[PDB]
Amino acid sequence: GPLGSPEFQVDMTFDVDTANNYLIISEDLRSFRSGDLSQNRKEQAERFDTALCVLGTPRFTSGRHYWEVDVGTSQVWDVGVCKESVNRQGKIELSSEHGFLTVGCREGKVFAASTVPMTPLWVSPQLHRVGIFLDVGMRSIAFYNVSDGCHIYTFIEIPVCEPWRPFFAHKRGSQDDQSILSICSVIN
Template identity: 40%
Template sequence: MEKTMRENRKEVKIKGFLFFSFAAWRNAPLYKYDGPLVFAVKLTLDAASAHPSLVLSEKGRQVAWQEKHQDLPSSTQRFESLPCVLGQLNITSGRCYWEVEVGNTCSWDLGICKDNITRKGRITMSPQNGFWAIRLYEGDYWALTSPETLLTLGKKPLSVGIFLDFEAGDVSFYNMTDGSHIFTFPQNKFHGVLRPLFRLWSSDSGPLTIVQVEEN
């Protein structure tokens, strides 16, 4: 399989990574850059963490807003202030990648967070508080640094790729529509468990959909 992939792929250099063509990315279970493996993780959403305003699809790959709060049991795992949901994945090592279709969704946050972040009360999303994410809000894109960093994108992303290198402390975001780099957080030293993070802002936001990794 490796030989076939090597023969058929088109390699594109982006910020030190060797990536395949978009078609190969979506159909391959792993990617290679400078030798180490980058796994395209199969990811679903964790219903136990979902804010009561968020509704998940049956297969757990899409999140949308519903105006009426659901009557859900209180839990230490559930977000009660921020309308967020986590991915059903605990990351403690290695390099991994996932892709989220944002389409015309007008307001969202995407990224990673520590598993032990505060999920109740007033929360500021920043690396100091265990969040590494980017945001689209009222037409502007932001990196949730402290203070926030306004981002200038050449083309609106319809799909966003999140790349995480745990040992290197690298969290990077790419516009999968044109292959451009969106933002990389300054290097961190990660400890404990990290989780994929998704946020919607209101009923006008629209859905977020995890792009399915197909088996080869």
């Protein structure tokens, strides 16, 4: 991607204790998608019971951290970070005032960031890979289009009193829809 300083690439995976019942994760724990059946999993506070969401395993409390998410052909998604202390049961309101700093896409390729009110975004029609840079020191989190390094939105003056957990969400477009969200990779 456009990340010039590789040292900040945070190779991660998803945290299964957080995934919602209707979310199927891959074996390498770096891809997922909502679905038909209900994966009856160990019900717990760390797991969303209603919304189709998962959390990256990391827990950032300081430093600069970068990771990429491929949203492929998905039509409905949300990416970013949420506070470790956010409520995971019931209605999840994507609001920076509820602890959610995300960028999302809805039906019709409409883009929006979770500010208060929501900030509309005009991103490339061919977008499919989002670059995220969490900078706790600068109290900001930025989003980028990985295909050309174009800046999408940046949140500033974000609170840094508790760990920030990578956030993810996805809902199929149709029964046949094969779209998936996958975290991206590695290095040398």
